[PDB]
Design an enzyme around this catalytic site. Structure first.
Site, PDB file in Angstrom:
ATOM      1  N   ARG A   1       0.837  -1.196   0.000  1.00 55.34           N
ATOM      2  CA  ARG A   1       0.000   0.000   0.000  1.00 55.34           C
ATOM      3  C   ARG A   1       0.874   1.248   0.000  1.00 55.34           C
ATOM      4  O   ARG A   1       0.614   2.234  -0.697  1.00 55.34           O
ATOM      5  CB  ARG A   1      -0.892   0.004   1.221  1.00 55.34           C
ATOM      6  CG  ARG A   1      -2.068  -0.922   1.021  1.00 55.34           C
ATOM      7  CD  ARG A   1      -2.867  -1.118   2.294  1.00 55.34           C
ATOM      8  NE  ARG A   1      -3.554   0.063   2.779  1.00 55.34           N
ATOM      9  CZ  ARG A   1      -4.153   0.068   3.981  1.00 55.34           C
ATOM     10  NH1 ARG A   1      -4.139  -0.993   4.775  1.00 55.34           N
ATOM     11  NH2 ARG A   1      -4.830   1.128   4.407  1.00 55.34           N
TER      12      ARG A   1
ATOM     13  N   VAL B   1      -4.464   5.400  12.571  1.00 53.76           N
ATOM     14  CA  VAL B   1      -4.730   4.322  13.531  1.00 53.76           C
ATOM     15  C   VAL B   1      -3.528   3.408  13.739  1.00 53.76           C
ATOM     16  O   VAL B   1      -2.973   3.419  14.834  1.00 53.76           O
ATOM     17  CB  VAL B   1      -5.974   3.500  13.071  1.00 53.76           C
ATOM     18  CG1 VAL B   1      -6.248   2.298  13.972  1.00 53.76           C
ATOM     19  CG2 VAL B   1      -7.191   4.413  13.147  1.00 53.76           C
TER      20      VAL B   1
END
Length: 293
Positions: A186, A251
């Site tokens: 990613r 997060v």
């Protein structure tokens, strides 16, 4: 925070003894801080059905800035204070937080960091999380935790947070190291961003990648301080210098903050807007992708 570093990790044994001895109440509050992608496990429901005795559900869907277009952004000081006060957490309370995610920890570092970015140092993550509480046979209930409301005073510890504007000024100063905790694919722009349409993957130029899952053992435990230290050193991340963690939505970036905290560095800042905000606001030149867009 404070260089008298309050213990960031608590074991399952420790917490089972405190549960068993009747210590959770106004001095010790325990939070299920579970959240899972739209479509998989229903966090809130899963809590109502099985949780450590006396634990409250900390809903990250609620304790966030709902008016923002970007993902799970901090609330205001007052918005956090009200939420946390109703869960019976005062400024003197030791808060322990776990989540029930499969490698032992996903969202609990975010809530540990939220308590700290609002000036509450006496918070710890359950090492092993709910996964190992279950595997060890410690007690669970479905019965509702009904704590007394308490007064909590939140004061935003702004040194522990970065905004879009600050990460953009850092691209011209390199006064902070920027680490991204997403999975390598990613970060490189070869694998897609989940739970989005039209959001490309890639990373902010000058980011170093430290996939957050590598701070955990396959059992769900945090790796030893000794191993974590060596991981920062292999990536050449200098733990005596300013470091900003970022990921998709602020997060798993908190895992880098937790890892560094166990290595003794209490002040990793989290770029809360992260990739989702960056992609939507940033000059396209500021980020790279091997898809190239």
């Amino acid at each position: 925070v404070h260089q008298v570093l309050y213990r960031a990790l608590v074991s399952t044994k420790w917490l089972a003894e405190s549960v068993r001895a009747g210590k959770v109440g106004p001095g010790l509050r325990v939070l299920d801080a579970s959240w899972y992608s739209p479509g998989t496990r229903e966090a809130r429901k899963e809590y109502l059905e099985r949780h450590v005795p006396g634990a409250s559900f900390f809903d990250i869907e609620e304790c966030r800035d709902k008016a923002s277009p970007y993902e799970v952004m901090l609330p205001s000081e007052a918005g956090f204070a009200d939420y946390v006060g109703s869960l019976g957490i005062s400024n003197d309370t030791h808060v322990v937080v776990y989540d029930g995610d499969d490698l032992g920890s996903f969202y609990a570092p975010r809530v540990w960091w939220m308590f700290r970015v609002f000036g509450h140092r006496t918070v710890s993550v359950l090492n092993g999380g709910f996964r190992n509480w279950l595997k060890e046979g410690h007690p669970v209930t479905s019965e509702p935790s009904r704590p007394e409301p308490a007064i909590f005073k939140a004061t935003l510890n702004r040194s522990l947070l970065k905004t879009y504007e600050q990460v953009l000024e850092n691209l011209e100063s390199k006064r902070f190291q920027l680490v991204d905790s997403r999975a390598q694919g990613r970060y490189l722009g070869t694998q897609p961003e989940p739970d989005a349409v039209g959001l490309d993957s890639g990373h902010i130029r000058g980011s170093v990648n430290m996939p957050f899952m590598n701070f955990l053992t396959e059992d769900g435990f945090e790796k030893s301080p000794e191993e974590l230290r060596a991981m920062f050193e292999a990536k050449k991340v200098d733990l005596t210098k300013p470091l900003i963690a970022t990921c998709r939505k602020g997060v798993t970036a908190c895992h880098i903050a937790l890892a560094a905290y166990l290595c003794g560095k209490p002040d990793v800042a989290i770029y809360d807007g992260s990739w989702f905000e960056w992609f939507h606001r940033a000059p396209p030149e500021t980020w790279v992708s091997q898809g190239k867009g």
